[PDB]
């Protein structure tokens, strides 16, 4: 509602980013989502046999592929439910290092993703000299924690959206938000 371009970034653009994307879009935010991994990773029959796909593979196709391997197994572990939710948001997972979109706020869901996002934007030369705030809100990679994390991220973006001058208030806003929730929220600035 405040014209803020928001991005939520994780590893695979499958679980945590899409849960936050889901709630941010329903609140009317200009939101996108990306993963920072090299390929999309989804769990499976064991730790040693994860389902790995190339970024750009449609959620529809990954749904049908998992449906054919073991439809009953991938319904009781929630992956088909998750793929269906993502299918209804956008076509395919996207890699953050490949996008040419620019944002006002970028939210990562763990420090590893934060580091990848920072190293990427620093590896590019500044052209527009446009700053973007990069925030880290830690979210554990499971269904229950992605849900709680998506609430924290949505609440955080909503509080920042209500500011009349976000740049002048963001440090104090994060400060209070952190204290209220006993979290550490890393926060730096990068340039396009």
């Amino acid at each position: 509602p405040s014209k803020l371009a928001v991005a939520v970034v994780d590893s695979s653009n499958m679980n945590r980013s899409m849960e936050a994307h889901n709630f941010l879009a329903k609140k009317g935010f200009n939101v996108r989502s990306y993963g920072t991994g090299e390929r999309v990773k989804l769990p499976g029959m064991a730790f040693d046999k994860p389902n790995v796909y190339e970024f750009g593979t449609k959620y529809e196709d990954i749904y049908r592929d998992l449906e054919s391997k073991d439809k009953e197994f991938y319904t009781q572990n929630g992956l088909l439910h998750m793929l269906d939710r993502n299918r209804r948001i956008k076509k395919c997972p996207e890699r953050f290092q490949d996008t040419k979109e620019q944002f006002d706020i970028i939210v990562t869901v763990e420090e590893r993703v934060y580091d990848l996002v920072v190293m990427h934007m620093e590896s590019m030369e500044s052209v527009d000299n446009r700053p973007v705030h990069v925030l880290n809100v830690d979210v554990v990679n499971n269904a229950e924690d992605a849900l709680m994390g998506a609430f924290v991220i949505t609440d955080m973006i909503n509080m920042m959206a209500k500011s009349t001058d976000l740049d002048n208030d963001i440090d104090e806003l994060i400060q209070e938000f952190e204290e209220r929730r006993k979290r550490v929220i890393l926060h730096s600035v990068l340039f396009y």
Binding site: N13, N15, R16, G35, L42, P43, P50, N141, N142, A146
Partner: peptide, 5 residues
Amino acid sequence: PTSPS
């Protein structure tokens, strides 16, 4: 790693 783990 995998999402979810």
